[PDB]
Design a protein around this ligand. Sequence first.
Ligand SMILES: *[C@@H]1O[C@H](CO)[C@@H](O)[C@H](O)[C@H]1NC(C)=O
Ligand SMILES: *[C@@H]1O[C@H](CO)[C@@H](O)[C@H](O)[C@H]1NC(C)=O
Ligand SMILES: *[C@@H]1O[C@H](CO)[C@@H](O)[C@H](O)[C@H]1NC(C)=O
Ligand SMILES: *[C@@H]1O[C@H](CO)[C@@H](O)[C@H](O)[C@H]1NC(C)=O
Ligand SMILES: *[C@@H]1O[C@H](CO)[C@@H](O)[C@H](O)[C@H]1NC(C)=O
Ligand SMILES: *[C@@H]1O[C@H](CO)[C@@H](O)[C@H](O)[C@H]1NC(C)=O
Ligand SMILES: *[C@@H]1O[C@H](CO)[C@@H](O)[C@H](O)[C@H]1NC(C)=O
Ligand SMILES: *[C@@H]1O[C@H](CO)[C@@H](O)[C@H](O)[C@H]1NC(C)=O
Lengths: 160, 312, 227
Amino acid sequence: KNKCVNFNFNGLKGTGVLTESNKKFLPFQQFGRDIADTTDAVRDPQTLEILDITPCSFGGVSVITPGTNTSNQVAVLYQGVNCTEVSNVFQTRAGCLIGAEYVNNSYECDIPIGAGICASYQTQSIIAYTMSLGAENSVAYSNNSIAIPTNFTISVTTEI
Amino acid sequence: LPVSMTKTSVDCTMYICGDSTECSNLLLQYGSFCTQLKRALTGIAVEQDKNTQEVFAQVKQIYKTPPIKYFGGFNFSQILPDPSKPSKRSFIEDLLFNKVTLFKGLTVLPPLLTDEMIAQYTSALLAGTITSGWTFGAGAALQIPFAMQMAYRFNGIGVTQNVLYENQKLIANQFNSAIGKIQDSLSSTASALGKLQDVVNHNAQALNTLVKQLSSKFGAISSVLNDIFSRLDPPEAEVQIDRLITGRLQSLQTYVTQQLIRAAEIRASANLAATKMSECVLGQSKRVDFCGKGYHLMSFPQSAPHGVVFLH
Amino acid sequence: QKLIANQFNSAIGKIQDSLSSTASALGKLQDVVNHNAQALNTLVKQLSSKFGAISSVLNDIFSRLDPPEAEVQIDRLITGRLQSLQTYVTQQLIRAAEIRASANLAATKMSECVLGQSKRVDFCGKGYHLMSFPQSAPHGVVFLHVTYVPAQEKNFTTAPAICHDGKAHFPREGVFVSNGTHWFVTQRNFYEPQIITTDNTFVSGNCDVVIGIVNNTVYDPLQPELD
Ligand SMILES: *[C@@H]1O[C@H](CO)[C@@H](O)[C@H](O)[C@H]1NC(C)=O
Ligand SMILES: *[C@@H]1O[C@H](CO)[C@@H](O)[C@H](O)[C@H]1NC(C)=O
Ligand SMILES: *[C@@H]1O[C@H](CO)[C@@H](O)[C@H](O)[C@H]1NC(C)=O
Ligand SMILES: *[C@@H]1O[C@H](CO)[C@@H](O)[C@H](O)[C@H]1NC(C)=O
Ligand SMILES: *[C@@H]1O[C@H](CO)[C@@H](O)[C@H](O)[C@H]1NC(C)=O
Ligand SMILES: *[C@@H]1O[C@H](CO)[C@@H](O)[C@H](O)[C@H]1NC(C)=O
Ligand SMILES: *[C@@H]1O[C@H](CO)[C@@H](O)[C@H](O)[C@H]1NC(C)=O
Ligand SMILES: *[C@@H]1O[C@H](CO)[C@@H](O)[C@H](O)[C@H]1NC(C)=O
């Protein structure tokens, strides 16, 4: 139990872990099926208690690189995988990133990782940071004051 | 108006046969379909995240609200964010977020800009449309009182400014009674936010049809491949596995193609939402029945999980 | 006019300095070419797949297998290639609808920003729009949206109205600003202080209705010349 092993209980061969359950099954049931035709729980044919079958840890591997022209250091991100199970470790909401330091200095988003956290080049090592939305500017509001400009600049903005 | 969707990413090996050793040696002769499908889904994922930044991150500087929240009789406590609750959203957006709510190789990717940062973009735009009027959308923020700001809203729609300065306490009482009845009519209605829900329910209906589609036998003996390899010879059952593999790959690409149309639908709605954020909130629009029914005066945007709500 | 003209030529002269330094500034039209060039090479390299048949080349299976068996693998390769060609145009039809929707956005922009003046705030560039200048492109269009941005701001004491002779006074164009111990009128987007007269103000009712009204004199321009 509690290991990724091949299960075969009167057929139904596959790969998955075995954990103790909590529901009260009916005695005529042999193997339980979850939604959309996936086997959730098969009871032991010998000792007659019930156990859930959870699939193995899987997910996408995202490699965050800054470009070969700058450096060769990378950072691997396992999407939706808690890396308590399989050099700095940072866990985000999308997954836990391996190979990047987390700083408190919030800057502009260069490489979109997810969940409000982006990565960029320090310049030496790959950093991880919360995205800086912008500088705070509390306007001094007053019911007896107005701001009117004295000069002006003409700007020409391009578009593609 | 809907802005973004659920960014989905599909795996190849677990969807077709679900952790089998036969698929890793047999799917490589099919070409590079697994490269092509993930280019389309990640092509959606950077696209839909671009649309929410094109709508909510239109401002560059984060404007903060003054502590003296008196604007000449007007009341904006229901649209400015609450400092007491830790989510920093208003009363309407807490009603907006609680009204609408929401493996086999199918994973869900969360968006980059989280909901508190969309609410912080909503709080910055609400502080800009109150303290400055049109100046924060066209350049630097100029401080202006709200009673004289509404005189700029009134002079643009053709009425001269003496009407507001004689009836300011009636206009301030009429707007506060109207904005108090907005959340009363929004919660009492059952299908007021049905547009954001059908976006969620259609994407929910697409993936559950996709995982039910593997349960079909595809004209073969069974839908599970462990029974096919055990009952027949591997040259005899190779025509049965290729019957299933092209059936499931067509099932996945049909899911990709209709998602590309729906992503092109909502991105076209998000560019429609991007101008309706710009002309109604960041400026004033002289159109007819664009920023609400009637002569446009002002607008107030509110946050949403997968959309945007304008109080025109 | 000497200040506006040199601000305009310095703004249009730094565009070639900005676009040559930022090589990824013109990335948006090149992904249109790069997505089509990657799609045709995907369509070309898909012929190397066997599609579950004996071989990827079709001439040898006509030469090796007998026609009672060879058309079975040919029909596998034909339905694999016809599905490859049908999906390629279908991904092209979604992409052509995106470019056509971008083309009508480009068509309405030159109709509104080049041929005339649009008063929308972030349609023809960021800021107060004055005019624009389109430029040619191999597969798109490049607009040079000339805008108007204010600068060198200054705070002033304001008032909604002015009571004089038992009567209120409301300005026609602009608002009332002040230094302190004086009051003048100016427009909104520029600072131009003028002496308050009856030429730019109008009287409507008494002055004790307006909240926060200040008391000051209004110089009638026909009064000192007649006396
Ligand atoms: C099988 O034998 C074991 C040991 O004698 C016993 O604990 C278990 O209950 C038996 N199971 C059944 C179904 O008889
Ligand atoms: C690396 O950068 C240099 C300097 O910009 C450039 O000349 C060179 O072509 C680049 N190489 C690659 C592979 O991008
Ligand atoms: C992830 O692993 C850590 C370390 O064991 C644990 O504390 C945490 O609760 C785990 N999170 C989830 C969601 O299982
Ligand atoms: C960020 O702040 C926390 C709390 O003070 C501190 O423990 C941590 O070391 C800081 N990290 C960096 C990179 O400064
Ligand atoms: C202006 O605002 C201050 C602070 O909010 C308040 O004390 C004062 O009464 C207001 N004056 C008017 C005329 O509204
Ligand atoms: C705004 O509404 C709240 C809630 O009823 C009330 O407590 C507050 O006094 C109101 N403020 C004004 C200025 O009317
Ligand atoms: C006006 O601006 C000056 C310069 O920034 C500042 O010192 C002063 O406090 C401001 N006055 C008001 C009333 O905002
Ligand atoms: C405002 O400041 C002083 C106040 O005595 C006055 O002399 C000055 O002329 C006024 N400014 C303008 C632009 O008129």
